[PDB]
C-alpha cells in the first residue's frame, strides 16, 4: 500500500527494513518492539535494494527464518 | 604425507577437495589436487576429517586416476636425507553447499562455493578471535561511503564483534561464555594499513575508545584472550597468589583510589605454562611518582625498565620475557615503586 | 618450472587455464596447457594465484591425465648445462565468468570469456598506465566515422 | 540528469540507443549502470 512496496523480492517489507528493524514470528516478519527482548527475540536490519545483502547464497527471509540448513550456526542467522 | 583437515567458520562444506603444495628448501616439489580416495564427504563446523579418535589420512598419488607415485631426484633425496624437512601449504579449496527445493529434498549438484568467494571478500571485513583451545574467523559486511546510492546499515566495530560471535551485554560489557572481551581486557592485533586507518580516525571522536570507530571496507582484525588475568573484584585466575595487594574501590576502571608504595612479587613454577615461547606482559598506567619492573627469569632478559608516566591518562605499557624449559625455576616478577 | 599468475584489469576470472611456451635458443621445447592440478579457482583483480604470502606453483607434466614428465634430449641438456637459461611465454588464457539467474544463484557453467575477446578488441582502444608499484590496462570504446 | 546532483556523488554517462551491449562485454547497459551484476568488478567499469 503506502508503506509496503518491497522493491527487491526479498519477501520482506521496506518499512520493517530500513527502520528500527523487524523480527519473525510464526514464520511471518512483523514490526519490532522493545519488550520482545525478555522472550528471546533479536533485532536486525538489512538492505532494501538487494535480495542478498551479504553475498552468501541465502536470501534475507531465508536466513532470518531458519529454513535453510540446521547445521549452520546461529551466529550467522542475522543477515 | 599424512594430513588431516579442519574447519572453522559458520557453514559446513560437502565434497571437500583441497590442493596442497610441497616445498623443501626454496624449491617446490609438487602441487597435488586430492583425488576420489582423499576426498571428504562432510565437514560440520568446528570438526575435522576424520574425527578425533582416528588416524590421519595418507596421500601418495598425483594422477587423476591414482597411479604414478610422487618422485624425488637424487639431490633432493640427499638434502632430505641429511636432517631437513619439507613444508606443506594449502592454496585453494573447492567444495559444495546445499540448497533445498520447495519443501522437498536437499540437492547438492554443481552448487559450488567457489564463485561466491571473490564477491564476499570484496564486501566484508575479517575478524578473527584466538583463544587457547580453538579459533574463530568471521566475515562482517561494511558500508562504502563513497557511493551515495550504496545503501546498507553502517555499524561500529564494537557492534560488529557483538554481532559476529554470540556475545551478551552483561553489565555494559560483553562476555563470551565466561570470558571477558573488552577494549582493555584483551590483546588487539592489526596489520599496518588498518592500524593506520584506526589511528587516523580516532581524532574525530569525542570519546577516545576504539570500539566506537567506524568499520571500513578492507580491514583485518585479530584478537587474543590473555592466559592470566588480574581483575580485582572477581575473575583472577591464578595458582600463585599476588603479594602486597590493596582492596578499595576495585570494581573496574574510573575508580583508582589506592596510592601505596613498596614492591609486588609473583612467582610461578614452569609446570603451569608451556616452554620455548614468547609471552607478553602488559598493563595500564596511573599518576604515581616512580616504579620499576624487574623480571628474574633465567635463560632470558632479567633486566628491568623504568615506568615514566607522560601524563595521568590511562596509556598502556607492554613488555616481554622468555620462558625456560620445564625446570625447577620459577618466573619471578617484581615491581618496585613509590606511588601506586 | 615454478610460476605464479597475476591479474590486472577490471573483472575477475574463474577457472583460469593458461598455456605456456618454453623456448631455449631459437627452438621451442614444449607447449603446455595447464591441467586440473595447477588450475586456479579464483582471481580477483589486482591479486595473484597463489596469494602474496605463499610459495609458487609447480608444473612438470604434459598429458591431460597427468603423467609423462617433460623430456629434454642430449644437445638441449648440454646447452642448458653450460650456463644458459630458458624463456617462458604466455600465448592465450581461457576462463569463465559469472551471471546470476532470476533473483537467484550465480551460475558458472560454460560462460566462457573466449568468444567476447575478438569482438571487444575490434571495438576498443587500449590505454595502459605504469607506475612504480603496479600496472593498469583498460579498454575504451571509440566511434567509427566511415 | 541535472547539474545539481554532482555534489551528492552521482555521475553522468551516455550510451548507444541502437544496441543492448554498447561495449561488447556480456553485461547490458542497465545491468552495468546499476551495480546489480557482481560485487567484485571495480567501480571504474560501471559506466557503459
Could you walk me through the main structural features you see in this protein, from its secondary elements to its overall organization?
This is part of a larger assembly, with 4 copies of chain A. Chain A has 79 residues and is low in regular secondary structure. Helices cover 11% and strands 10% of the residues of chain A. Chain A is built from 2 helices and 2 strands; from the N terminus they run H-E-E-H. In chain A, strands 1-2 form a two-stranded antiparallel sheet. In chain A, strand 1 and strand 2 form a beta hairpin. Chains in contact: A-B, A-C, B-C, B-D, C-D. The interface between B and C is medium-sized, with 32 and 29 residues. Chain D: This is ADP-ribosyltransferase binding component.
Give keywords.
part of a larger assembly; 79 residues; 2 helices; 2 strands; 4 chains; little secondary structure; 10% strand
Topology of helices and strands:
This is part of a larger assembly, with four copies of chain A.
Chain A: H1 15-18, E1 22-25, E2 28-31, H2 60-64
Antiparallel strand pairs in A: 1-2
Amino acid at each position: 500500500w503506502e508503506d509496503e512496496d518491497l522493491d527487491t523480492d526479498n519477501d520482506n517489507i521496506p518499512d520493517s527494513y530500513e527502520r528500527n528493524g523487524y523480527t519473525i514470528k510464526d514464520l511471518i516478519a512483523v514490526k519490532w518492539e522493545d519488550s520482545f527482548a525478555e522472550q528471546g527475540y533479536k533485532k536486525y536490519v538489512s538492505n532494501y535494494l538487494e535480495s542478498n545483502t551479504a553475498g552468501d547464497p541465502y536470501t534475507d527471509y531465508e536466513k532470518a527464518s531458519g529454513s535453510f540448513d540446521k547445521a549452520i550456526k546461529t551466529e550467522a542467522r542475522d543477515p | 604425507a599424512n594430513v588431516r583437515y579442519y574447519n572453522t567458520g559458520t557453514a559446513p562444506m560437502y565434497k571437500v577437495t583441497p590442493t596442497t603444495n610441497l616445498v623443501l628448501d626454496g624449491d617446490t616439489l609438487s602441487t597435488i589436487k586430492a583425488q576420489e580416495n582423499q576426498i571428504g564427504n562432510n565437514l560440520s563446523p568446528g570438526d575435522t576429517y576424520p574425527k578425533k579418535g582416528l588416524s590421519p589420512l595418507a596421500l601418495n598419488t598425483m594422477d587423476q586416476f591414482s597411479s604414478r607415485l610422487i618422485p624425488i631426484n637424487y639431490d633432493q633425496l640427499k638434502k632430505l636425507d641429511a636432517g631437513k624437512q619439507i613444508k606443506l601449504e594449502t592454496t585453494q579449496v573447492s567444495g559444495n553447499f546445499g540448497t533445498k527445493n520447495s519443501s522437498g529434498q536437499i540437492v547438492t549438484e554443481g552448487n559450488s562455493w567457489s564463485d561466491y568467494i571473490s564477491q564476499i571478500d570484496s564486501i566484508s571485513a575479517s575478524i578473527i578471535l584466538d583463544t587457547e583451545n580453538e579459533s574463530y574467523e568471521r566475515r562482517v559486511t561494511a558500508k562504502n561511503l563513497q557511493d551515495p546510492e550504496d545503501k546498507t546499515p553502517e555499524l561500529t566495530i564494537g557492534e560488529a564483534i557483538e554481532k559476529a560471535f554470540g556475545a551478551t551485554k552483561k553489565d555494559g560489557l560483553l562476555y563470551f561464555n565466561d570470558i571477558p572481551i573488552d577494549e582493555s581486557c584483551v590483546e588487539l592485533i592489526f596489520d599496518d594499513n588498518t592500524a593506520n586507518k584506526i589511528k587516523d580516525s580516532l581524532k574525530t571522536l569525542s570519546d577516545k575508545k576504539i570500539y566506537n570507530v567506524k568499520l571500513e571496507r578492507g580491514m583485518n582484525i585479530l584478537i587474543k584472550t590473555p592466559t592470566y588475568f588480574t581483575n580485582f573484584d572477581d575473575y583472577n585466575n591464578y595458582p600463585s597468589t599476588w603479594s602486597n595487594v590493596n582492596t578499595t574501590n576495585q570494581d573496574g576502571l574510573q575508580g583508582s583510589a589506592n596510592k601505596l608504595n613498596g614492591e609486588t612479587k609473583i612467582k610461578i613454577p614452569m609446570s603451569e605454562l608451556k616452554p620455548y615461547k614468547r609471552y607478553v606482559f602488559s598493563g595500564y598506567s596511573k599518576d604515581p611518582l616512580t616504579s620499576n619492573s624487574i623480571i628474574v627469569k633465567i635463560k632470558a632478559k632479567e633486566e628491568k625498565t623504568d615506568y615514566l608516566v607522560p601524563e595521568q591518562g590511562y596509556t598502556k605499557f607492554s613488555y616481554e620475557f622468555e620462558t625456560t624449559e620445564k625446570d625447577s625455576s620459577n618466573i619471578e616478577i617484581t615491581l618496585i615503586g613509590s606511588g601506586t
